[PDB]
Design a protein around this ligand. Structure first.
Ligand SMILES: [Cl-]
Ligand SMILES: [Cl-]
Ligand SMILES: [Cl-]
Ligand SMILES: [Cl-]
Ligand SMILES: [Cl-]
Length: 319
């Protein structure tokens, strides 16, 4: 009678949770987390108490190899038929959805204050602009920042090549970092709203939630299209030891109902990247289109190649 949901703060719209609660006469314990590292920690060897968790594609692959996830019974999730074919092809960490079901696919991008920066190219190299120095931020995320640098240099955002990573590190350290106030994943949208940052790396839903609607026309948010910018996919997974698998499946099935998925997308101004029905049911014009995610590269599990990422990033981030 209770579903234990573990997800990013606000990521499951409470409005949808109430509906699932009213429909099934159940209650949802929704514990939030601020990162997949933190989520992972609760689900570490061996068993949290959760029925559902929402990891990104790299963390689905990591958690499969560490045997942290339970097989999903797709017969209990008929609405899995709404998952676009194009998405099915990209989810190589779990292509048959045996351990995961897609929740959302999007990408971080760049917001530019068009009144403060009238001329700019719509590219990552915007962070090398010395005329905007100390009025920009990039995200406090290693895979996003390294990924953007790798993308810009024509390298795979998931590369395992050591000289490509060093090259990316030099790009961030020597070309972008000197122009940044800081790396910031939580204050950038507010600082962008005040005018403190005039260009910032981040999520469209944050920039637009945080800036009054009156001032939206002055924002150009874009995911750079001239390179294979990093893209993410988040998924429902059932943690090892889940006590209520029946409600876990029922919730994934509920979330993927066209009107209920559309209500999810509309909450954040998301396009229907994964769902073949939901766009018809949406009330909100998306902040970016699904076609903006085509050229980009899905962030994946890099395996050991992580040690090189870590070593370069800790230097970028703490020096
Ligand atoms: Cl705990
Ligand atoms: Cl500063
Ligand atoms: Cl937000
Ligand atoms: Cl503004
Ligand atoms: Cl290294």
């Amino acid at each position: 009678d209770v579903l234990y949901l573990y997800n990013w703060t606000y990521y499951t719209p409470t409005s949808l949770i109430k509906k699932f609660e009213q429909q099934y006469n159940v209650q949802v314990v929704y514990d939030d987390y601020a990162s997949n590292e933190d989520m992972f920690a609760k689900l570490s060897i061996g068993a949290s108490g959760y029925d559902l968790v929402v990891p990104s594609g790299d963390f689905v692959s990591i958690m499969k190899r560490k045997h942290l996830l339970e097989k999903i019974d797709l017969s209990k999730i008929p609405n899995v038929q709404f998952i676009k074919e194009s998405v099915r092809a990209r989810i190589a960490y779990d292509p048959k959805m045996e351990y995961s079901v897609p929740y959302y696919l999007g990408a971080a991008g760049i917001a530019v204050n068009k009144k403060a920066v009238p001329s700019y190219a719509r590219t990552w190299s915007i962070f090398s602009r010395k005329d905007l120095a100390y009025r920009m931020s990039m995200m406090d995320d290693m895979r996003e920042v390294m990924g953007a640098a790798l993308a810009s240099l024509g390298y795979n955002v998931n590369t395992k090549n050591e000289q490509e990573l060093a090259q990316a590190a030099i790009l961030v350290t020597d070309h972008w970092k000197p122009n940044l106030v800081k790396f910031d994943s939580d204050g950038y949208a507010k600082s962008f709203a005040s005018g403190d940052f005039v260009v910032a790396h981040g999520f469209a839903e944050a920039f637009f939630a945080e800036t009054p609607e009156a001032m939206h026309e002055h924002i150009d948010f874009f995911i750079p299209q001239d390179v294979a910018s990093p893209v993410y996919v988040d998924s429902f997974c059932i943690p090892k030891g889940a006590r209520n698998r029946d409600l876990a499946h029922a919730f994934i099935n509920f979330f993927l109902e066209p009107a209920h998925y559309a209500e999810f997308l509309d909450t954040f101004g998301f396009p229907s990247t994964i769902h073949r029905e939901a766009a018809a049911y949406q009330k909100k014009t998306p902040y970016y289109s699904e076609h903006d995610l085509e050229r980009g590269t899905l962030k994946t599990d890099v395996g050991a190649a992580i040690e090189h990422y870590n070593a370069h990033w800790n230097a970028v981030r703490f020096r």
